[PDB]
Design a protein around this ligand. Structure first.
Ligand SMILES: CC(C)[C@H](N)C(=O)O
Ligand SMILES: CC(C)[C@H](N)C(=O)O
Ligand SMILES: CC(C)[C@H](N)C(=O)O
Ligand SMILES: [Mn+2]
Ligand SMILES: [Mn+2]
Ligand SMILES: [Mn+2]
Ligand SMILES: [Mn+2]
Ligand SMILES: [Mn+2]
Ligand SMILES: [Mn+2]
Lengths: 314, 314, 314
């Protein structure tokens, strides 16, 4: 199988500068090289260049709507293209708003996919529910069919077509949810596993359950959208929205490994890694390193070890 | 439902100064305010003023017995008063010795209550088993019926009436038990979940089991007596008896949330937070903050999010 | 039962200086004294003195083969001697390469023993698979019967006799395995529980399973070879091969306690504690302290508490 890395150095989705540098940091950490060492064929598609929409006025509260919509429209395009060719897309990005694009494009080629969202937040605020004007917190809203029309059209997202329904997505790691967001997910009956459920069940049962839930009937393509703030700050401190009591490094890797074992990994998102937000270089090295780890995990690397087939090491 | 916060700035239960400042710290962290944001009606009853008993001689080994017994007798009174009115008591305190009062008063109004004790210790030493005259380590002994007479009467605790038996209390988080203490709990066949049980079962099964055990037959009122040292030092470092390998922040919240879900929370104790014992302001900010969190959890705040009823955020 | 502490201040098994100081550090932490406080009879056999083999040339890649083989031959001797007498051997050592000796000697007296290997690595590289001539990474290879002849004889290990087979050993905590090592363990069908299994099952089921696997049919003696890097660097930072996302302090203790409860603890190894590798004195105090704890755990100390029999504390 083939892998196509795609940088998405974007940051207008939120108010803290730095996330754009994410892809650079990950690459610098030897993501590509390491990935190549896997049983997969890899090709770096470089970092997309986002044209900045001059005079991007704040749609009501939402900020930089046109910049975000265009950047995403450009991504969904690049993504759909590679998916078409039958290669696994890996978007290294800035903020989580780019998920809109990454997923829209993926849906185009595999309209039946499901989405596994590991984040500490739901990012399902509609332009009508956000406190901030931050789009990195509304991604899911632009992708859910059930939310269609539930909020004004947005300057630049005209091109988006609610691809998945609330029955095809599953959260994991929720711990900081806005009232509006809770309302929604409860109303649309969206499956989820907040840290309280992870606590109760254990990452073991969690994955077991999300898999039956999303792949019980039909076996569809999987889209792993990983918000790095999904892990506890102690592992991925360099992020914009650190929230305590999150997923442990192990839990993070257990997830990525099980998804590997399904063999249904079609698309992947590694978002929110902000190099500039580390209090000590260590914090940044740490954040990045596990990001890479989660990635390699997705593509094979087991914690029990791996050996090349047909080779008698003895 | 109504909530009544009660400060118990007491510290004679143990040898390290600072715990009295506990309530102030918690309030300063905006405990009251936040609580108000909950679906509950809150009223701060202020910090009780404890009259210091001059020439409080050490009964054998036990220290400051009269100061402790009077402070508690004063509390049990204030507590019984609010419980009477049908409001939920929340004792913000200094050391865990004030549990005597908090519980005695609570029993008066609900003699059928059960007690969930999250602590790293048992605090069940009788004045005959303590190494240190510290009363903060003997609370349970003064409350257990089965221990009645098993130790000399104590200067000031005359007014106490062993309210609950060993069949109505359950420990959670034990990890530093004195030989005398182990003898007792094993002899009185008291239900408990030490870190080794939590490790074996998982906080999931733990809560499940303590609930069946204490609420299987009849549904009674719940009294949560939370010793802050129940969580690993890494979360609540600012305490007098830090003991490694304790309850994780998550585990702590899971507990408080399940108890919320029973709807049987009648009384609550937030003890041992000592602001002065933090090596770095962070350690104190950290300790306090999660204390508040455990509190808000008890009263609703879910990690999955919360939304106000009858409001269409859409 | 009797306990015999044996220091093995060795370090030629690997390239970082300091591990020889391990025993000193552990003793200085009051290991002996504390052990004495247990229901066990203890005797310190002091630290063996290892004669350095001059002009120890690198057998191909392997480094200091003769120094290592001799030091081990000297240990297996000292060990076999105490085992003979019917006392439990506790090897406090430098690097994990001394496991060769500790186990060989133990096998002599109890050829039916089983080995529980808690380490973050497998240390099963044959002199033909190692990237680094480091012997501390090949211990298991010199002990497995199934590996006999699968690699050239080594200058000084002539005296070793593959005592156990792949059906009598069980790993716990694996997370950094070399390709060669993975090949082997997969080829020899060796039972193991890498962190991913621990994640799936929980330390509870893990121990339960390893016990049924190794003690299902016959009840044999247990040899606990504990590599300190088995625990996450956040607990035992002072080691040469720190690897993230490892065994939690609790998990570590849970293991040692269960093995205590089988009553089949015959031999024990506390390896890799390197006092000189701590970034801050705290890291070293921390590493050592838990080492001691895992030890006392093996010999009784429960997290739920312990009380002396026949004594009425009341
Ligand atoms: C980013 C997220 C935590 C949040 N929903 C917001 O308002 O941006
Ligand atoms: C406080 C507690 C750990 C202990 N039982 C004592 O003697 O005070
Ligand atoms: C030490 C270990 C991690 C490794 N197998 C080596 O080559 O030394
Ligand atoms: Mn996000
Ligand atoms: Mn997030
Ligand atoms: Mn206590
Ligand atoms: Mn305590
Ligand atoms: Mn080792
Ligand atoms: Mn190791």
């Amino acid at each position: 199988k083939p892998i196509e890395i795609i940088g998405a150095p974007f940051s207008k989705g939120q108010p803290r500068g730095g996330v754009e540098k994410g892809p650079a940091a990950l690459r610098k950490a030897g993501l590509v090289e390491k990935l190549k060492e896997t049983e997969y064929n890899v090709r770096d598609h470089g970092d997309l260049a986002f044209v900045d929409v001059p005079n991007d006025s704040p749609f009501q509260i939402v900020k930089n709507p046109r910049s975000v919509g265009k950047a995403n429209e450009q991504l969904a395009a690049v993504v759909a293209e590679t998916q078409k060719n039958g290669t696994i897309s890996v978007v290294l990005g800035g903020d989580h708003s780019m998920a809109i694009g990454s997923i829209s494009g993926h849906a185009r080629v595999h309209p039946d996919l499901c989405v596994i969202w590991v984040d500490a937040h739901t990012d399902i605020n509609t332009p009508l529910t956000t406190s901030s004007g931050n789009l990195h917190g509304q991604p899911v809203a632009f992708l859910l069919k059930e939310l269609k029309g539930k909020f004004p059209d947005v300057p630049g997202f005209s091109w988006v077509t609610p691809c998945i329904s609330a029955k095809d997505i599953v959260y994991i790691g929720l711990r900081d949810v806005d009232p509006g967001e809770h309302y929604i997910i409860k109303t649309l009956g969206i499956k989820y596993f907040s840290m309280t459920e992870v606590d109760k069940l254990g990452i073991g049962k969690v994955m077991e359950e999300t898999f039956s839930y999303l792949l019980g009937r039909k076996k569809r393509p999987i889209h792993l959208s990983f918000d790095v703030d999904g892990l506890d700050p102690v592992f991925t401190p360099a992020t914009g929205t650190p929230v305590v009591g999150g997923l442990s490094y192990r839990e993070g890797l257990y997830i990525t490994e099980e998804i590997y074992k399904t063999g249904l990994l079609s698309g992947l998102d590694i978002m929110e890694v902000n190099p500039t937000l580390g209090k000590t270089p260590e914090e940044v090295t740490r954040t990045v390193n596990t990001a890479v780890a989660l990635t390699l995990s997705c593509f094979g690397t087991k914690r029990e070890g791996n050996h090349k087939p047909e080779t008698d090491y003895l």
